[PDB]
Design a protein around this ligand. Sequence first.
Ligand SMILES: [Mg+2]
Ligand SMILES: [Mg+2]
Ligand SMILES: [Mg+2]
Ligand SMILES: [Mg+2]
Ligand SMILES: [Mg+2]
Ligand SMILES: [Mg+2]
Ligand SMILES: [Mg+2]
Ligand SMILES: [Mg+2]
Ligand SMILES: [Mg+2]
Ligand SMILES: [Mg+2]
Ligand SMILES: [Zn+2]
Lengths: 174, 37, 216, 144
Amino acid sequence: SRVGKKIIDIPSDVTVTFDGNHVTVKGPKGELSRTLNERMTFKQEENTIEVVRPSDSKEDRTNHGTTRALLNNMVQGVSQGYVKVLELVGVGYRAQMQGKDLILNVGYSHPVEIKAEENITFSVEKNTVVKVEGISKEQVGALASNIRSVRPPEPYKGKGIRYQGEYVRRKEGK
Amino acid sequence: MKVRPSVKPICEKCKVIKRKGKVMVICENPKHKQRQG
Amino acid sequence: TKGILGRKIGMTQVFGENGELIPVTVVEAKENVVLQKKTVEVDGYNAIQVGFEDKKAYKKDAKSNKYANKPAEGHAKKADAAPKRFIREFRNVDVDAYEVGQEVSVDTFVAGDVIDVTGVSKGKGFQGAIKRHGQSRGPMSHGSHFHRAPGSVGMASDASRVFKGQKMPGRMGGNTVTVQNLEVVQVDTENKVILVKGNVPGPKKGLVEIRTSIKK
Amino acid sequence: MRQTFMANESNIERKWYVIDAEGQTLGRLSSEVASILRGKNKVTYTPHVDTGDYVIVINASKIEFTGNKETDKVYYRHSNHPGGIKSITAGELRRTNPERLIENSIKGMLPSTRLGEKQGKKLFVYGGAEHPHAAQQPENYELR
RNA sequence: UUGGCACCUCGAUGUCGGCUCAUCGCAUCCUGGGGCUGUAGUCGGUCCCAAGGGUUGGGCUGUUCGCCCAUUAAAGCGGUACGCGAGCUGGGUUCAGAACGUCGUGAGACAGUUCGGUCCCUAUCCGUCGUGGGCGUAGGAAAUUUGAGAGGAGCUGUCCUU
RNA sequence: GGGAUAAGUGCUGAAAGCAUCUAAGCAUGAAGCCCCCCUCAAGAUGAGAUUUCCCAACUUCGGUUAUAAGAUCCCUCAAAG
Ligand SMILES: [Mg+2]
Ligand SMILES: [Mg+2]
Ligand SMILES: [Mg+2]
Ligand SMILES: [Mg+2]
Ligand SMILES: [Mg+2]
Ligand SMILES: [Mg+2]
Ligand SMILES: [Mg+2]
Ligand SMILES: [Mg+2]
Ligand SMILES: [Mg+2]
Ligand SMILES: [Mg+2]
Ligand SMILES: [Zn+2]
């Protein structure tokens, strides 16, 4: 696992604490705690961390790559955070913020409201762009997916909620 | 989705994968999406 | 959530605000008292036990259910109440809202309350499959020797038996029935009468249990 | 000459044992308990009498399965009514009624006889670590 | 399904269709959830999941079918002795009468037709539906109950608004 | 309405520096499943719970006894049959 072999460089500000299998990572933006694979062994240096796999068995190899990535994501997340941007397309499609919660109008009789989650921030620009910001890459990804799911992009005109950098296949209706 | 005993790449982009013990083909082209069954 | 015990008196009609004819059932729910409060601690569940309709006190050589037996008299006395003909538990109500020996009034319910009425349906005795299970008759003419019979009760060698739940002649009625989403048209405090819109199960003089509707 | 000893109620002594189900495979625990209940571990074992000992199983909720049994092992029961087949998974049974899971497992390893039913009644199973049979003064038993 | 075979039944395992009562499978007719589309929308096509419930009345014919009229969300396909005659019918078929065509010298004959033509049984056991008595449930009782289980229910249209 | 799911749809994610819904992990998802609703139900021989009622003399000291609370016979009946 080349991914597993690659060391994670701890930012000077960020501090990583390992308790048994569980690891708690503290950074300026937030603190993230997760449980890594038991078999994997972690070597910690002041400026870097190395994950070590006990055996070359597939199971150990698979977990090694995953474990490294999970730890890397936590460290990066606390340091810089992760943000996903979604852009509404089509006339009359607008996004607005009701306190923490986000309100979406997407060609439905009912307005759609997405509640904010802990360690997540919802921000809207121009009422056509929504950005989800959080320490956890997964949490940002999940909420972005939920927002995108409210109205997925249509093929013919591209109308819908889409990721900013997403590509949509286009078809000619008539 | 195409459900068939013979699941194979239709184009160069098609990728054979296994999900939940099932041979499947994933592709940018939706038509080439396949699941063995 | 509220509950009361009453006797069905009969049916009548009331004219609504817009002059619509409202079929109603008159229930008399006098003499309701909370005999006991069941708790999770002692009983494993919370309920109020309500005794309805006073019965005569214990006598030495009582030959009928009109006079309270010594066990019954004691149970009622613990609530400081007269012995009761009918006793039922209400699990729907909040136990805290009630105290033992408290009278439960008809005024607990108010007009427009949606209620479920529970009672034992009228007995019909031994009844055939047509009336009991609403089956079709056989032909009355054209050579038919099949009129009110139940029909085939099975198949052949595969199953060589009748399945459980085959519909056959038997005793019909006298079953507990709950009619849901009925409405309290009116409450008469003076006569201790609750007017329930529509009809409820059982003969006149039958026991009815009125509860706040489970579905809301 | 006929000299074989025969155990009878007068000479039979039944003991009480506690077995912890925590970290034990269901079947392997089950097979061992079945032998204890049937008196197979006694030198005075006699077929037509119950020479077995009472068994208390604790922490039934913590019994373990191998492979995908939790979802793929299904218990089927019929009500004797047409189409009356009802199924719950072993995993769900463990969550909801762990005592039944253990009890049915052991009873299925006991003979379907009047004696076998009696021997199954000597089994007491509890999902938690606490049992109410302290008066019986049960002895801890370690599975071989 | 049409057959092949001739293994249980010839000291009898009643046979078509309908009626009554169903019950099960899912290769799903409708309704629910999806993928792909040569999917603009409205509609469709095709495939996957799904058996919870639902799945109409007539004309003709003994009919099963099938065609037709009018509907319906839909008018599903199969198994259960082509389910069910000690539950019903008895129109067809499969006795004795008679006739036509036809064949036969004839007596007669015909998966050709035509008309007429006896459907028995007081339920012992299991099974099923109801309804009591005994004993048990470590004293004898009266009331009120928990719910391990088990059964039931489970369908859809149209219109208005957006 | 709730919980868990199907076909699906994903998020994060390596084996496999990419990619990938899956392997670890995390979501979402049917008239279906388990409930929610209705009815029966402790012969549930695993026979459960609560409240109340009854509680003495004899005796060979083994136990018996009619009586208690209670319930029936019999009788007048119906909302029951
Ligand atoms: Mg091909
Ligand atoms: Mg009819
Ligand atoms: Mg007649
Ligand atoms: Mg031969
Ligand atoms: Mg014979
Ligand atoms: Mg299928
Ligand atoms: Mg037949
Ligand atoms: Mg027959
Ligand atoms: Mg005939
Ligand atoms: Mg012939
Ligand atoms: Zn392709």
